[PDB]
Design brief:
part of a larger assembly; 4 chains; A mainly beta (84); B alpha+beta (136); C alpha/beta (94); D alpha+beta (58); B: alpha+beta; 4-stranded antiparallel sheet; D: 58 residues; alpha+beta; Ribosomal Protein L30, Chain: A; 2 helices; 22% strand; binds magnesium ion
RNA sequence: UGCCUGGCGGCCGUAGCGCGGUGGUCCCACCUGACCCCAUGCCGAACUCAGAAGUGAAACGCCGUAGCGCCGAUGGUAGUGUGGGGUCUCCCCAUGCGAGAGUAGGGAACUGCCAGGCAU
RNA sequence: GCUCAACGGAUAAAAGGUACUCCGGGGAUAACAGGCUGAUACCGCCCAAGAGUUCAUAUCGACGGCGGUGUUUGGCACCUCGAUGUCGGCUCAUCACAUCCUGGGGCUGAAGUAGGUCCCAAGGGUAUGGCUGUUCGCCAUUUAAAGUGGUACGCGAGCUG
RNA sequence: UCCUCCUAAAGAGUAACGGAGGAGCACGAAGGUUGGCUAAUCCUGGUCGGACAUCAGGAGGUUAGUGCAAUGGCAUAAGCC
RNA sequence: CCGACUUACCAACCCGAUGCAAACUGCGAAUACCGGAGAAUGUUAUCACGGGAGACACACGGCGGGUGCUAACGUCCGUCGUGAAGAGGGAAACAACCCAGACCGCCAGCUAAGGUCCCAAAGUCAUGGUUAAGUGGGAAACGAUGUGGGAAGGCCCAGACAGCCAGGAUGUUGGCUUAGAAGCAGCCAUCAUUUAAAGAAAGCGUAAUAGCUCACUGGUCGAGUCGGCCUGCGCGGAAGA
């Protein structure tokens, strides 16, 4: 014909971005309950004064200053808080 | 016709051919064909060069292919408009950076190996040069 | 047996090394033993003809810096990817 | 307190937003304008950022 | 105060593997027996109980040794922010930052509290 | 209690034709032509396995590579939808040269006749009919030859339809 | 409409009729807690029995597993009883 | 009754040496982002609330990409600049490129990009070099004793590179193959001899011979010569209305 009709793709789908990542970095002063990192799995583990939610959201269990550190035999990344 | 037996995915992004090469030394044979320019070597191009180069030396010595076509290239058919998904895989190519050794040769005299690589480089789009093995 | 006249580098880095190679010298280092490593520069063409020999890379070389003798070995060589040039040379003392 | 003199030698029409803010933090308003600024590492960093378009006399 | 041993940490491979040797006073481990407390999808293997005949074999601790693991410069290279150029699919120059790999080397952990045994 | 899944869900409840058409708009958006590009196409060149009795390059030329032109099929949607009339024919042309004839030349697997293939050359010249709306094409018979392409696939305020 | 990865340029976000896959559930245990336990694969030996069933030892160390895609995570297991 | 070997076959796992990856990571930047502190600068440039909007067709250029042909003044994103909504100077003419942001007037001066022989303002400026192609002032693979520069190499008054004179010989027509293969279709060998030298021959030629040169050598001449490597600027490749 004058023009050749094309096909169709089968890859159009994608899901919404979940806004994961670190919310407060090292040195941030946070209130109790502040979300530090939103995660899939425990890439960062909960240290002192830090709690882990059902979806592994790390949140502050006290007022203070955020600190990242590496601890344990496995060199895992822990998030703790110095109470200030 | 060099081509991967199976691939994890059948199509790949266009990408960019930047940087210098890895594998710039004659590691297997005694002589080598080294790419001076950059570009794409199709499997047909590589195989045509291999036929001339192996036939030049009267099937003597040993011939090494140092490059492999692992990047699939898609082409839209004639007279189809833009869009409607990505095109179909037509052929495969290897990306070539300046300095990469494309072919190696051993077991033959240097004057014969030089002549064989001349005929072989006549089939390649990229500028080449003749190199020999060195002790590092 | 090979005598290499080399002068210690005044400045180092990417810009300095590229300027040096444009001026037809190339950087090299001498490390080993207990003395701190010494960064030298030396003439490209003289050493390019010298290293065309196979015995250059095995036998003991001589490097003259500030009129003082250092006994070295050609530990490694970095060549230009396609041009017949030397980017850098690693030398080991004794 | 080397108290150096900063002059602007080039225009700020199509410069990056960061470079425009650096000129404003240095206090330069037009080509040929000259200002008095105290010699601090903080000020020397500003001069280094926009060195392609300012000159320093001291 | 010196050595040996046990427990709880710091630390997270320079600390872990391998190879060789070495220890039973105390300790540790193997070990003896088991209606029983307690336990096995069965099984006193493990867990548990009652004990101390034997033994340091395994294990565990210690000592030595690079066949590995690991750590690792200097220099160079790749990349790159800013500004400027070219022959602009890619590069180059000024300046700032500067890897990865590799090399020379390093390397058979160091350390804190308490408890016990030997010796002074 | 909703494949209200057209999933921020028009109504509880709904498919088509229009060349008999009509209005408001858009070159925001297609068909012709121009424009950009040049995958494809055409032309040229690079390397020579081989065909050519033998002999790669008289003549061809595999597998491959690099360009040119704007010239086919395309890609895009930049211009025109308060209109740029769209094929073929007739009349009248004009340019380019990648030359169909005539002119000059090199090589030939050029004995002569007659060719083949390149190089130079655009001064002039370069069919009539049968059949189809045809351009083409096939066919008949000529010719020294019945060239290729651009000119809005030249030319409808010049004709035809 | 929703989920996972890439494009996405090391914070977030980021388009195309871009490249690939899934969901419209399931489970009163497959949830809570306490206690306990640790794979894939290969070698050697062993009745039917063999490449590959159950068993013993060794190597190996998560190369397994997760009710269902993909990514991240998981031994203090989030895996098994 | 369980066995013990072997060969030029296939050969997984493993080892050593090599590359490749948007949907690979035992590594890993520059930047960007978040936060804390300090100075200087900035007409609060920041946030909040309220009155009024417009706008939700973007375009090109740089950089990072997807798609397309790393085709398009193509298309789709990120980011910056410009145009939109921006005059002026430059790029011949040329919204988006380079320089630079027009409050008004002046027959004042200095500069930016870009330029200075004439059109047309300003160097027929100074020093050193290169090109001969009007290259400059379109285009590749590829080709060539163009020409400049650099580092090294071979030979040479014991006579070197040309050229000229003379030889270039005996096993031998090496064997195999082939209708023939006589140095020279093709295979294996490529050795001996007299030599000053000479190849079981580099090429032309023959149906096979024959014949003609070359390698190599002696003489003649009597001073430099030959071939690669790197590199600057040129040359051909290069045909449209
Ligand atoms: Mg799919
Ligand atoms: Mg730089
Ligand atoms: Mg470094
Ligand atoms: Mg490093
Ligand atoms: Mg390293
Ligand atoms: Mg809807
Ligand atoms: Mg909707
Ligand atoms: Mg109407
Ligand atoms: Mg209208
Ligand atoms: Mg339009
Ligand atoms: Mg059109
Ligand atoms: Mg558009
Ligand atoms: Mg128009
Ligand atoms: Mg119209
Ligand atoms: Mg009108
Ligand atoms: Mg012509
Ligand atoms: Mg005339
Ligand atoms: Mg008629
Ligand atoms: Mg015409
Ligand atoms: Mg027309
Ligand atoms: Mg008309
Ligand atoms: Mg009329
Ligand atoms: Mg009329
Ligand atoms: Mg991100
Ligand atoms: Mg980012
Ligand atoms: Mg809208
Ligand atoms: Mg829009
Ligand atoms: Mg846009
Ligand atoms: Mg556009
Ligand atoms: Mg603006
Ligand atoms: Mg507007
Ligand atoms: Mg303007
Ligand atoms: Mg103008
Ligand atoms: Mg002036
Ligand atoms: Mg004048
Ligand atoms: Mg002058
Ligand atoms: Mg010209
Ligand atoms: Mg013959
Ligand atoms: Mg040229």
């Amino acid at each position: 014909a004058h023009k050749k009709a094309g096909g169709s793709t089968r890859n159009g789908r994608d899901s919404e971005a979940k806004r994961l990542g670190v919310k407060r970095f090292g040195g941030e002063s946070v209130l109790a309950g502040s979300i530090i990192v939103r995660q899939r799995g425990t890439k960062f583990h909960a240290g002192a004064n830090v709690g882990c939610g059902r979806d592994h959201t790390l949140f502050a269990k006290a007022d203070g200053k955020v600190k990242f550190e590496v601890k344990g035999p496995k060199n895992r990344k822990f998030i703790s808080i110095e109470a200030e | 016709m060099l081509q991967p037996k199976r691939t994890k995915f059948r199509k790949m992004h266009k990408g960019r051919n930047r940087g210098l090469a890895q594998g710039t030394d004659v590691s297997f044979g005694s002589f080598g064909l080294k790419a001076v320019g950059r570009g794409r070597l199709t499997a047909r191009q590589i195989e045509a060069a291999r036929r001339a180069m192996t036939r030049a030396v009267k099937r003597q010595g040993k011939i090494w292919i140092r490059v492999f076509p692992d990047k699939p290239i898609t082409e839209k058919p004639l007279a189809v408009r833009m869009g409607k998904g990505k095109g179909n895989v037509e052929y495969w190519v290897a990306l070539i950076q300046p300095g990469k050794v494309l072919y190696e040769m051993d077991g033959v005299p240097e004057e014969l190996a030089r002549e064989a690589f001349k005929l072989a480089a006549a089939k390649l789009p990229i500028k080449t040069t003749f190199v020999t093995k060195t002790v590092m | 047996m090979f005598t290499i006249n080399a002068e210690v580098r005044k400045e180092q880095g990417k810009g300095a090394s590229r300027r040096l190679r444009a001026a037809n010298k190339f950087p090299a280092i001498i490390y080993g033993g207990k003395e701190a490593p010494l960064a030298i520069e030396l003439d490209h063409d003289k050493v390019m003809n010298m290293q065309a020999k196979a015995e250059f890379y095995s036998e003991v070389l001589t490097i003259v810096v500030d009129g003082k003798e250092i006994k070295v070995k050609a530990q490694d060589v970095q060549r230009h990817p396609y041009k017949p040039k030397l980017q850098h040379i690693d030398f080991v003392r004794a | 307190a080397k108290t150096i003199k900063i002059t602007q030698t080039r225009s700020a029409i199509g410069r990056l937003p960061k470079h425009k803010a650096t000129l404003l933090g240095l206090g330069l308003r037009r080509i040929g304008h000259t200002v008095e600024r105290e010699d601090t590492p903080a000020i020397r960093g500003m001069i280094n950022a926009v060195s392609f378009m300012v000159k320093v006399e001291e």
